[PDB]
Amino acid sequence: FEFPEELKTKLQEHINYFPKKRQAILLCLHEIQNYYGYIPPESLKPLADMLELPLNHVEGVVAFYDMFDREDKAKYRIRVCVSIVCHLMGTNKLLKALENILGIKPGEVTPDGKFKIVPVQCLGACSEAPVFMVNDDEYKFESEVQLNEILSRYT
Amino acid sequence: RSYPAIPRIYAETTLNMLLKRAKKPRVHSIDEYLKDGGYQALEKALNMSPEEIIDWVDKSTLRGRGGAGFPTGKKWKFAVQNPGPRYFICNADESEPGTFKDRIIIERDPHLLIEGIIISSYAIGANEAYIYIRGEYPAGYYILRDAIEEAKKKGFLGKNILGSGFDLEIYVARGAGAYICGEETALIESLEGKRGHPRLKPPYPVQKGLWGKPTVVNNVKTIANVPFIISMGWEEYRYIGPSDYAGPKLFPVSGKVKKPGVYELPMNTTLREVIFKYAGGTLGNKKVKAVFSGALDCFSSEELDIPMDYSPLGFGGTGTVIVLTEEDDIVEAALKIAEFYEHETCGQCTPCRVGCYEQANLLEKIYKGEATEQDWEGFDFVNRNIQPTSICGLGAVAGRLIRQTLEKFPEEWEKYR
Ligand SMILES: Cc1cc2c(cc1C)N(C[C@H](O)[C@H](O)[C@H](O)COP(=O)(O)O)c1[nH]c(=O)[nH]c(=O)c1N2
Ligand code: SF4
Ligand code: FES
Ligand SMILES: [Cl-]
Ligand code: NA
Ligand code: NA
Ligand code: NA
Ligand code: NA
Ligand code: NA
Ligand code: NA
Ligand code: NA
């Protein structure tokens, strides 16, 4: 397994960015998941080599940080907050609307591999509860009609 | 400069300091920042010795805004007693439920924070600084990177800043989903490229931190006060608000209020005033049942007339205000808090690892109505035994809010028994 050059360039830049290269491990993992739609298990050995780290160190890191996913590939991660404030203001309405539209529950990926719903802890936007992200973009949920419009932006 | 979409968090201020620009929901770039006299505090600071700055920040009485309330002056003074090199770290992890205040400074007034970092770094003789921002704040990340380049182009960063002889680079690091990486030692650990496991203390970061070197970790908001201190002077600054807790305070208000948002107010403000006078009262004008102080504390409706200070009978915490009204099920709410600590324990200490999990697992059974008597007795026991042997604050507080709900709302828990 070798990365495409395109991806390798970006990884190298993160590694050169910090004073020590191992400090770039999280930026590298973000970049990989962004590029593949997940962290391929086979990516970790060649990443460890670039970071000058042992594999088992990288495995432990991927395991510790909940943003990273090694199981399911998805083009768009719909992160839905399930913490206290969003719960009060209508997480359950958001999840139902997602189920009505996409036909999937938290932890599931649509059959086309397009969208995965990912339950997350507080996203630090509690005043705009209930909150969700679609990859990097972040929104308050107002209604099913409004959610349907937002999701239509991601092709 | 297109950034990811962000919701427009409402912001209001009576002091017009930290929220001077950030009350408007947009990126204030360097030209606009310079037009408000931005970076002039930095210019002033560079004509003072590092020691003078440490003194000014000390005499200001500025306390850390990250939760612990530690005096910033003394902290800086401790780090400079130990030989260099020294590192400065901006804590932008903000992952505690109900807290969404640091992001608005980052996303709207990044130059305020950067100016603070530069002054602070020069004060402790740090030639490298880090912003550690959580990974669920991607816009803040991208905004900070661009702001740093802007400041670099204008000569506020790099080597020999404005002929001063001071060198500084600010590196921006991203998290990847771990509340615990807001704890200062676990942040440094993450910054070193490892899992976010808190270190036994002592030693403290100011002695041994990043790469075992003197390290100051300060919260975004603590840092953002520094330009104001340099600009106004320590004597003027200390007279802002009550004398015990001087300076502007930011209160994130969420839940069942009409005007949820970030409010910049003095700390002599009341809980009742936050909710009704500023946050516009409750939704539907329902009666307030409880206020969750983030994931830390639970106050009842009989406790709204208390100051928002770190006084004995004060609100304390980080002034986080989540409002619950009369129809809200608080054992359902308590479960949500349990579920947070379950997902965030790092696992190093056994009572925390096992207690955070069991607290949530058992409370879910209670909520669903499938708990046995042994599950009830065991929930109680687990709740009072998360703390022992714990080496960081999370273990010490994982059962606090829930315990207070049992004590302050017994009638509501009896319903589930
Ligand atoms: C579990 C947990 C989580 C956090 C913290 C503590 C603990 C125990 N702390 C406090 C942090 O360790 C430290 O006290 C402050 O960052 C120091 O900065 P100030 O002196 O407050 O400016 C903390 N601080 C902060 O700036 N942002 C955060 O998100 C958190 N999160
Ligand atoms: S108390 Fe909990 S969160 Fe803190 S170090 Fe121990 S196991 Fe980790
Ligand atoms: S509780 Fe959902 S964003 Fe804070
Ligand atoms: Cl602490
Ligand atoms: Na977020
Ligand atoms: Na913006
Ligand atoms: Na601007
Ligand atoms: Na202006
Ligand atoms: Na914002
Ligand atoms: Na984090
Ligand atoms: Na986590």
mmCIF file of C-alpha atoms and ligand atoms in Angstrom, chain A residues 121-125 131-133 136 138, chain B residues 6-7 94 103 107 134-138, ligand 5:
data_model
loop_
_atom_site.group_PDB
_atom_site.id
_atom_site.type_symbol
_atom_site.label_atom_id
_atom_site.label_comp_id
_atom_site.label_asym_id
_atom_site.label_seq_id
_atom_site.Cartn_x
_atom_site.Cartn_y
_atom_site.Cartn_z
ATOM 1 C CA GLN A 121 -20.934 14.784 22.094
ATOM 2 C CA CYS A 122 -21.494 18.550 22.424
ATOM 3 C CA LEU A 123 -20.245 20.447 19.374
ATOM 4 C CA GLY A 124 -19.984 23.771 21.234
ATOM 5 C CA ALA A 125 -22.914 25.485 19.523
ATOM 6 C CA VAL A 131 -26.772 21.143 16.023
ATOM 7 C CA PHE A 132 -25.401 18.937 13.249
ATOM 8 C CA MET A 133 -22.417 18.962 10.900
ATOM 9 C CA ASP A 136 -16.953 20.612 7.990
ATOM 10 C CA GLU A 138 -22.320 23.183 10.674
ATOM 11 C CA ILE B 6 -21.026 28.166 11.041
ATOM 12 C CA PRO B 7 -24.318 28.967 12.836
ATOM 13 C CA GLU B 94 -13.846 23.922 24.479
ATOM 14 C CA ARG B 103 -15.223 29.823 19.393
ATOM 15 C CA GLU B 107 -14.023 32.847 14.521
ATOM 16 C CA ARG B 134 -10.701 20.902 18.942
ATOM 17 C CA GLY B 135 -11.281 19.121 15.624
ATOM 18 C CA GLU B 136 -15.030 19.860 15.615
ATOM 19 C CA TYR B 137 -14.064 23.550 15.127
ATOM 20 C CA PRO B 138 -12.720 23.323 11.505
HETATM 21 NA NA NA C 5 -18.768 22.402 16.387
#
